[PDB]
Structures are given as C-alpha cells and as structure tokens.
Symmetry: none
Subunit: 48 residues, 2 copies
C-alpha cells in the first residue's frame, strides 16, 4: 500500500473506507478489514 | 507472575492470549491489545 504510516507502530483509520484500517509496524502498513459490520473507532483503537 | 521483559526494548507475545502482546521500553512492560480480530504475529512483531 501507498498509505503512509504516521508512526513507526500503531493502528490507523483508512480514510477511504470506515470498514477498514491499517496496522503499522516499523513504518510498514498492512491493510485490514473490520469484522462483520463494525467500523474503525479512533478513540477505542479497534472496530466497534 | 508479572511479565518480565526479555530485552530493554521489544515487542513480545502474550502466552495467555493470542490477541494481546507486551511492549518493553527500558525493561518496563505495557500490555496491549491487537485491533479487530487480529492476533499477535511474533515473527513479524505485529498484529495480523
């Protein structure tokens, strides 16, 4: 992905899809899907 | 027994829960959750 990790490690929203998110480790992002019909919850750092 | 850091800095599996892990900084640990239904991936030091 061309998503740019804002930090070396962390979980970040996908600005293009509220049903997805990115997990960064050592500045490398992996695109993930929220389970079921859940959506990224910024303050919870998970899908709700 | 309280998790003991194996290294000064590092990311380590939680042997009790595949959804959790520990982050070590200056030999002190913080217990963390993986997001969504992801699970800790030791080899890649990330949630997968």
């Amino acid at each position: 992905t061309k998503f740019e990790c804002p930090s070396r490690f962390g979980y970040f929203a996908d600005p293009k899809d509220p049903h997805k998110f990115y997990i960064c480790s050592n500045w490398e992002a992996v695109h993930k899907d929220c389970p079921g019909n859940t959506r990224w919850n910024e303050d919870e750092e998970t899908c709700t």
